[PDB]
Design a protein around this ligand. Structure first.
Ligand SMILES: Nc1ccn([C@@H]2O[C@H](COP(=O)(O)OP(=O)(O)O)[C@@H](O)[C@H]2O)c(=O)n1
Ligand SMILES: Nc1ccn([C@@H]2O[C@H](COP(=O)(O)OP(=O)(O)O)[C@@H](O)[C@H]2O)c(=O)n1
Ligand SMILES: Nc1ccn([C@@H]2O[C@H](COP(=O)(O)OP(=O)(O)O)[C@@H](O)[C@H]2O)c(=O)n1
Ligand SMILES: [Zn+2]
Ligand SMILES: [Zn+2]
Ligand SMILES: [Zn+2]
Lengths: 155, 155, 155
């Protein structure tokens, strides 16, 4: 059993929607990023790479490499997962916590769990996603951006 | 073995004391919330629900439902725990990290561990609580609110 | 198997370099602290003490005690580890996430893993360190300080 932890942040910028956990969520503003800025999947990817001792998302897929521009975070998720499995690991379970004042993540979580479980080739029960606001405090409370944390357990 | 993670924040507002980890801690200002605003127990609850793949505190006990107004966070903690156990889980251990510039949590932690272990029906040794300031940085460093993180391991 | 979580923050102040994960990293400003302000090792220490139910770094090594002034965080790391092992624990694995806009931690991570694994008497593979910026948001995004999170799994 191996434990991992990931954390990510992306700033709001431009027009909506935003992509979180693979879900296109309607919002007044979008998120600024090289890729699709999916904070939830970056934090998850890092948690999994962390538990595998493979480093982090930026070590494997550089901000500098042009191909990663506009990149689908689920692709990165699946690749990191491919490499993790090849190192001999299997999924224990993952838990994600989206820290955002808005939009409301609640209704999109079921679909998120479907995408993530698909990507990790596991059952939805091994995947949990949740959300919380920082009750108007901070860059998140001010609507400046979204953050996300995640933990993973590999076997 | 299943892993979970929780995170919560509540803003200062009104008169003291504050309730953290179930402990009434004297402070110049109190915390604003629908319930008692116990940041430590919300973060813990989410960590446990997360490890169980039951979602989050707000999914089980809505901000909208009036009964939860003024609600004792230990009640929510015990209920979430009831449901978790019914899903077949048993406690491995939990670790909580209170992020607050003040007040000093240190002297109240023993009592916190007593309440939490009581609520989870475990031994104090399976429960750990700690604290840290953000050295004057951020909404926490500015005394605007308190945050808390927690991880849990279920069996 | 026992899980732990740690979190720490230190403000920039003075002249560089900074010490992170035991590595002297050149930077325009340094970090303000009683000790060497190694955010990465404090967060790690707490994660390990947390998994062991030993509390936190400040419980074991007080800000008030003068000896800890200028103190080498690896010393504290090794001591906390000594005490943890004496309580009967063995390392499962640790994962660290440095949240800093700058400097770039990437090139110093290998050396960090060497120091940490040395200190914990484990193999580098049981140690992972990663980094992330908060994309210009927050006290970290503003260059006001560095934060760090860590999780640990004890056996
Ligand atoms: N202080 C920092 C921050 C990030 N990094 C590295 O560079 C990348 C950070 O990029 P980022 O903070 O923009 O995160 P994303 O835009 O990939 O979501 C990370 O993936 C780390 O590998 C670093 O070495 N030092
Ligand atoms: N961006 C967000 C934030 C929270 N939520 C949900 O709604 C609740 C958040 O309420 P909250 O941030 O005020 O936390 P508490 O006041 O219950 O401590 C969470 O329990 C989540 O279920 C969400 O769907 N999307
Ligand atoms: N709100 C708080 C914050 C910290 N503390 C305790 O006092 C110490 C916090 O000191 P700190 O936030 O300056 O962290 P460091 O300077 O040791 O890195 C922690 O080690 C906790 O034991 C507390 O009791 N209540
Ligand atoms: Zn990202
Ligand atoms: Zn709360
Ligand atoms: Zn520190």
């Amino acid at each position: 059993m191996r434990i991992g932890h990931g954390f990510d942040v992306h700033a709001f910028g431009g027009e909506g929607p935003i992509i979180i956990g693979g879900v296109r969520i309607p919002y007044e503003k979008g998120l600024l990023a090289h890729s699709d800025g999916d904070v939830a999947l970056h934090a998850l990817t890092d948690a999994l790479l962390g538990a595998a001792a493979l480093g982090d998302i930026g070590k494997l897929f550089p901000d500098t490499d042009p191909a990663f521009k506009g990149a689908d975070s689920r692709e990165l998720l699946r690749e990191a997962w491919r490499r993790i499995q090849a190192k001999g690991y299997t999924l224990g379970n993952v838990d994600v916590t989206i820290i955002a004042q808005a939009p409301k993540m609640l209704p999109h979580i079921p679909q998120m769990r479907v995408f993530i479980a698909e990507d990790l080739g596991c059952h939805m029960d091994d995947v949990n996603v949740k959300a919380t606001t920082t009750e108007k405090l901070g860059f998140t409370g001010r609507g400046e951006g979204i953050a996300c944390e995640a933990v993973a357990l590999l076997i």
